[PDB]
From a paper:
The initial enzyme in the degradation pathway is 3-nitrotoluene dioxygenase (3NTDO) which catalyses the oxidation of 3-nitrotoluene into a mixture of methylcatechols and nitrite. 3NTDO is a multicomponent enzyme system which adds two atoms of molecular oxygen to the substrate through the sequential action of three separate proteins. In this reaction, electrons originating from NADH/NADPH are transferred to FAD in the reductase, the first redox center which subsequently reduces the plant type [2Fe-2S] cluster in the reductase that, in turn, reduces the terminal oxygenase through a ferredoxin. 3NTDO from Diaphorobacter sp. strain DS2 belongs to the family of naphthalene dioxygenases, and has the ability to remove nitrite from all isomers of mononitrotoluene, 2-chloronitrobenzene, 2,6-dinitrotoluene and partially from 3-chloronitrobenzene.
3NTDO-ODS2 is a mushroom shaped hetero hexamer (α3β3) protein with a cap and a stem composed of the α3 and β3 subunits, respectively. The α-subunit contains Rieske domain (residues 38–158) with a Rieske [2Fe-2S] center and a catalytic domain (residues 1–37, 159–447) that contains a mononuclear iron at the active site. The completely conserved residues His206, His211 and Asp360 coordinate mononuclear iron. The tertiary and secondary structural elements as well as the essential residues in the electron transfer are conserved between 3NTDO-O and other known oxygenases. The structure has been refined to a final R value of 24% (Rfree = 28%) to 2.9Å resolution. All the residues except the three residues at the C-terminus of the α subunit could be located in the electron density map. The pocket size was found to be 445Å3(3NTDO), 295Å3(NBDO) and 693Å3 (NDO) respectively. This suggests that 3NTDO has a bigger pocket size than NBDO and this could explain the formation of other nitrophenol products–by facilitating binding of the larger substrate. Ile204, Met251, Asn258 and Val350 which line the pocket of the active site of 3NTDO, were mutated to corresponding residues of NDO (Ala206, Leu253, Val260 and Phe352). I204A/N258V mutation gave nitrobenzyl alcohol as a major product from all isomers of mononitrotoluene. These results suggest that, for nitrite release from mononitrotoluenes both Ile204 and Asn258 are equally important and their role is the proper anchoring of the substrate in 3NTDO.
Residue numbers in the entry:
A (entry chain I), B (entry chain C), C (entry chain F): 1 to 192
D (entry chain G), E (entry chain A), F (entry chain D): 2 to 445
Write the structure that this text describes.
Amino acid sequence: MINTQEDKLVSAHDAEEFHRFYIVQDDALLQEVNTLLTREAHLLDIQAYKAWLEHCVAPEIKYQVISRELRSTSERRYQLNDAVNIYNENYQQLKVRVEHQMDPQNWPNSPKIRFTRFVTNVTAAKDKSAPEMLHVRSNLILHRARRGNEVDVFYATREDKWKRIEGGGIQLVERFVDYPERILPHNLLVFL
Amino acid sequence: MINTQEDKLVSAHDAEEFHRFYIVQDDALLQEVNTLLTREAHLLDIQAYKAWLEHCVAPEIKYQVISRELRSTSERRYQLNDAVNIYNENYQQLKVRVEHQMDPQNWPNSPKIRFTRFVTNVTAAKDKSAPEMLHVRSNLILHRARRGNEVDVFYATREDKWKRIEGGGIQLVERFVDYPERILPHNLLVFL
Amino acid sequence: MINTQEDKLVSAHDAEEFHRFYIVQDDALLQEVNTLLTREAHLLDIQAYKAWLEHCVAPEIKYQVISRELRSTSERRYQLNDAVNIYNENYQQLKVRVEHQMDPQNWPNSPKIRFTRFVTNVTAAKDKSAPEMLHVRSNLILHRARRGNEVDVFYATREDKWKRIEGGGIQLVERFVDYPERILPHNLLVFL
Amino acid sequence: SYQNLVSEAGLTQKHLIHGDKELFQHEMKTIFARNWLFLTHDSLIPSPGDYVTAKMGLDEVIVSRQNDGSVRAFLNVCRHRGKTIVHAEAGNAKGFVCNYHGWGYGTNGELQSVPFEKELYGDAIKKKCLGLKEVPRIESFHGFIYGCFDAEAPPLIDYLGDAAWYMEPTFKHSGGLELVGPPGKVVVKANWKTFAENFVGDIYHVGWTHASILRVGQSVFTPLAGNAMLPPEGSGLQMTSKYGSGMSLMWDYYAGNHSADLVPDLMAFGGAKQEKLAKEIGDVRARIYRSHLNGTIFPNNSFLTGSAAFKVWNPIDENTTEVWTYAFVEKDMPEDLKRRLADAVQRTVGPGGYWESDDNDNMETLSQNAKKYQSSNSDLIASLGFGKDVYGDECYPGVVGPSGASETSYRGFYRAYQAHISSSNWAEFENASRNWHTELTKTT
Amino acid sequence: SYQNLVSEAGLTQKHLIHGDKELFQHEMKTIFARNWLFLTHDSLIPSPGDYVTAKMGLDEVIVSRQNDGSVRAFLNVCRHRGKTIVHAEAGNAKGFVCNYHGWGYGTNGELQSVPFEKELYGDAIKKKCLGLKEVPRIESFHGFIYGCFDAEAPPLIDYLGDAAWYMEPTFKHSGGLELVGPPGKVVVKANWKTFAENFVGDIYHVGWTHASILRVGQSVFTPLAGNAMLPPEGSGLQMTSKYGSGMSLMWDYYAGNHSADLVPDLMAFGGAKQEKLAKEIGDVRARIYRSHLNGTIFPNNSFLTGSAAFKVWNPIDENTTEVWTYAFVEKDMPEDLKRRLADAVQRTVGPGGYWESDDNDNMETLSQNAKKYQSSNSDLIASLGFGKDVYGDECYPGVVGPSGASETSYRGFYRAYQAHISSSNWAEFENASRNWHTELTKTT
Amino acid sequence: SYQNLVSEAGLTQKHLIHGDKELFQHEMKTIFARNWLFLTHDSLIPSPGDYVTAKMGLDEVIVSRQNDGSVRAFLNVCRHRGKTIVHAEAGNAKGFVCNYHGWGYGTNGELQSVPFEKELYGDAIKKKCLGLKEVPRIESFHGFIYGCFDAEAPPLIDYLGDAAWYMEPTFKHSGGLELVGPPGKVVVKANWKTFAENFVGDIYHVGWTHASILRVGQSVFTPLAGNAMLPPEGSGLQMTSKYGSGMSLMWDYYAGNHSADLVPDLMAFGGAKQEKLAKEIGDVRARIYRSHLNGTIFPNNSFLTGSAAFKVWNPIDENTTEVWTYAFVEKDMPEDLKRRLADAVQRTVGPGGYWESDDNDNMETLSQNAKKYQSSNSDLIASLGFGKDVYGDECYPGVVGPSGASETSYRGFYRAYQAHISSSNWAEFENASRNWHTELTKTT
Ligand code: FES
Ligand code: FES
Ligand code: FES
Ligand SMILES: [Fe+3]
Ligand SMILES: [Fe+3]
Ligand SMILES: [Fe+3]
């Protein structure tokens, strides 16, 4: 348990999230979320974007990837906005994106792009109020190679909300990613 | 479940493999395969090549790492071969290879080389016709450093067949890797 | 099982460790150690250093990160020391280190630094003599980005001893890391 | 030398200019030392003491709001041993301390406190000679603050030349814009001129490069997909300036590249205000307000009216640039419409922008090939629409061509580029530009 | 200057040539613009419309089969804004479209279709003046197609000089070879010359460097392990040409570098043909067929007969090259023996190849040390066998030395290298090589 | 040119010197080719045959203990095709074999065995003319071994000038030091001169840059936190020499930067020896022993007495250096105190060292800014304490200033640096340093 008055470097957000996990010790739930995150990462790797959107993405989805502005650690007066939304999509906006990738005149995707992604550090907890809801945290390395000698590697932590669907499925409701490099090393047209 | 007519970017191969997994929820099988892949990567990291070949590799092994040529996605006429075999080894070829590594006049291995392997995204399914067989998919980052300031990282997905043997062991029969960079960044004299 | 007479490239050390693991198949124990190591990497990622030191690190801690000097593989006469101690800390020394990080005039930490770390290849075994003890092996990629366009990535295997304490906790008593790049790529002011 | 890199009337240019490392060094002296450069907007440093850091070419400057309401900008380099002083992108500071030794500066650049002055420095130091290196020229255009390190420079409004006229409906008579921070920041491997050149008037590319998102997002630009049917005569124009800046005008496409989820409310609001404007400003200029401008203010600042994007292509090296991407909103838009449009600019031409990604394929290889032996002295052609350009139209402000799909601003740019590139000062640049409109119409 | 980097008769050379960056720039002018470079084989672009992409030094070209059966190659650069046109390594195309604005080109280099030509370009564009930059000279050698950017070049067969004679038993009289694609592609941090020189005639290294797989794989080369016992005089020879190309001949070693699983069948099959060849071509030349050549066709194409590898060392920068690795097979081999030998070439000198990795240790540090102050003007010695070299042998055509372990081709190579490096055109190189056989045979 | 990069009396220097790529190339010629450079210590190559590899600027040398007890050093490059010969950092060798073709060298640099000499080389190889390129000048200072590639260089002891005197209480009269391997090795993106200059006399930074570990580690240096109150003058001094080397002296701080776990025992031990030392060497010099020096032996070797760190800033390029970090211990310390101090130097100024980490922030941007257009011809000031230094104090030998918080050694350093940079040989440097002390005291 984290005391923010002593632990001077911890965010209020980072701390509130840490206190969700590592309490209840549910092995069942862990095997569930591993299947989920893996299947999702598998689908994005083989570029099965349609299936990802239909089966994995819940319709009420918020899909957010922010780039935070670098303030002084002592800042107490400057109050303009904190963060850009690199990604802040509802289902319709994601749908356009998926449809963009599959379109036969999408020049950057000829020859086919190779995506391989590594998912680690997974933990999950049931929301205490609405138990159908699932908080899940996971880390991700994404390797993106194309046209021979172009390569880009991405590193990200993803704070996820997943909800149980009536058909026995589970779909993604919320993804928040605080992308840790402020100047992104290449254009992030990939799903994290 | 993936429809290739709708999901325009998906391989015939990639779809047939995806349909093996994420159906059965066998936690016993998952811990078996985790122990397997971890032990195998442990053996290769400490360079215990002989042990890997005699304990982990089945004698009938096909060990394949291909480099696919970049075609247009609209290509419909050009039919020459698609792929080079960086690796396509039967047991004896692997034997020569491991024996090459252990040989005392193997100049590139002085000073001793450092291998670190990271294995994620492991899932598996029992083969339906021959239940002794195990389909196994795993992703791999391989870190290889030597001579102070020389370092190389490889990223790869490995499609594996493992067979259950005599004393309760399990050995590798088929390992296929479609290595995702077309121009390799440095020479891949390592087992993936 | 490794015969170091046949397996020419293996350390006696690397071999003595390999023989601890992958014999007993304790899924209970593995879930314990995963919860352990993830919780710890989470705390260090959100920079909750104080909690890491109080809750995760046992007071008797030896925390060692060495840089081994590059010798010939045939060396049999040169007997000077083998290794630098980048890290070789007891509780008090770590405490200063932690306290250095939290200090409000620690200029390198403004703007706040982003850490994300990926843990894979986890195995554990009970010490046979002292069952209170836990041998734990884990691999770690650590991503450290700051000030826009600065990034450094670290790769390492961590050989761990973890001890069960009476309050119901489990804490780290020994960390040994043989950091595999001899010339470090940037200053390693991070906990592995 | 560096003469004869772009031919007469700006018709061809040597491919080498998007790659040569020698010349990129010359540019830091002759392009980014000499000309006006975008720093920030009033909307992001409003209160006194507010500061941001901004690149002026390779140099990083600190831009600070003064107590008298002024704005001044100084190098983020120390006067002692030369450390970098401020490592935050934005904030509000009572002053700037450089934590190598503790030297203290005013938000106004003065060296205000040096530790142990009396003891160790004594007579050897005098703090009034050790102020930060100050940007000499700082002026403004309806909220957008621009710096220049050359003091002989023409005033900002003159430098903007005949392009100001087109910007005014959207930058002034709309009530004015605020800029929405923070910007998006990405590296793309391309010489900075390739984006400058794309944005100064590459409408030719929209129908083909962007054929996918037009079909799938149904921008108000879909009447161009496949480069099949250009919208008929009644399409638009393209325009260039004496001082390089130019733009392409596309009538009534207020929604620019945005996707159909926004297209209704954006065009609603912008037709609403168009009526109000025409009573105050007249028919032509009120339409320009609700039309779509894409343009580059020299050298490396681009905007998209209607699409509502503000880019700066910050140079890193001959084959890399750092791309900042802000949204601008009209101040009297409802807050929720501001929110939606702020996100939508990122979704389109940000780091994760599907328009800017398609676009980078062209920009990257464009400059990679510039490095190659057999292609570096090849001649790039900007002939599209050439000879249909005119000066002194009774109604339209600059040197004008009759489609937005033209390359008239291309030649404008590289005419000015070559003029700066071969000249030692502002004095000489003007002497190579007395006949600038004649040069660009020429034989016609 | 650039004179006096390789000494008289090529005996020494300044180490700096494997690292100096200015020089690499010169080489692109005087070496890769000037000389023949491997593009592809008929077997990989056979039908009309078939194309592959190939590097010619730094430049990338499209090499395309014409409908009339011909072959032509063009710069993979666009004539408009200079984008790259084709992003595939191979394919079959009815034409090449550049997806920036849509300009459409013929498989013949001609600009065939411009979007909106009538509307926007009108008289300012011609299309017949805007064909792709065509490589002026393309020629052939029993299927292997070589391109050149200098039209004043000597014909390919002449340029191959006294080297053609050794090549013909394997390239012509075997019935001919097909090349097996795709090639392997890898980066190694080493200057391209270090592989050129290794393959031009370094048999000296086999016994020491490759001592590891010699012991463990039982190549037919095992009689060299430890550099202990050379195969007696009756080992082989080495040869060099006026135009740089050279090789080392090792009698009867048809299989090795290949490992013992293949060694039986490769030697069986190749002895069989050797009888048949001897009836048609005679004893000596049929033996050459079943022997092992290692050689470099100037400047950067290397081969291994018998081992059956075809390399190209593609320059990237002074300390980097891109290494393409094909197998060649004799057309009348059985399908399974073709299959086996194609994989086995990769396993030995491919990306995952245990021969080429052992060899990279030598090549990398060889060129890293060239950059160092105290070693940059040091002299590398290619003195092995000097003075036992001879011209105009009654049997053996070129400039010939008496073991495969020689450095006769080394001096051959770097003599031609210096000749290009110091000369402005093909005419001047010819004037510096009038006396080329005299120079290398010298004193003895 | 390269004149006027450091102004008269070393008072200012152009910031460009920490970034310019041409200059770094010049430095390899006029600085690291010319001056003494740290190789290793007797304590690390003691037995005959023991060797280490060490950098001399860019060049890598092999440093070998001879059988007659001597020491010799050779380039780690081969005489044949130029491979690197030894790939170990340390070891003990019967000789050095280069595994390209098998050439064998003696521990004395002589070429001892060539495979197939009689067969293939015969008369073309002389053998005795093919020894490794040997370091001509190597000398020692109480165990510390230094090399130089210019033979006209002054002896090491003279080169050390008036600085040997301050060093001797710790290097000599302590009983002598052994160096503890292996060193730590890290890359930091900063030009080497930034560490040289930091260590020659930057005490000004200790109180501010290092404010955090002072508060938290309670070094004997804590009376400086916040740069609040200097220990009164009765603080220390700083000194510079004709041949560049300089240092800052801080009285009685024997346990330098170390944290409180060691501070008791280190100061106990070092005071004990201080008693004994005073009877042998006198009051002043025995105090110096138990005091703290921070200093740089020109051009790129730095030490910290008391804190017990021995650094070498190895150049890689204009904006990168490789930083080696050994501990030294006084030989008669207990084994456990040697253990503790060996780790604690790493804990402090090692790869994971919290002192050097804080400091790298200053060093990185210090040199990043040197590349920027508006900052490359800016002036760095070394004015702290200027005019308060004197020569020929008849107690304190060099050019001396009255606080360790001074920049007198800066100007000493940058005076010699400018002297080398503008002169072609040691002769010319001497003619520019005839009046070296006068220059530095001049106006007072
Ligand atoms: S450099 Fe700013 S503190 Fe001296
Ligand atoms: S550059 Fe090829 S289409 Fe314009
Ligand atoms: S290079 Fe040293 S053996 Fe030839
Ligand atoms: Fe576009
Ligand atoms: Fe070889
Ligand atoms: Fe310091």
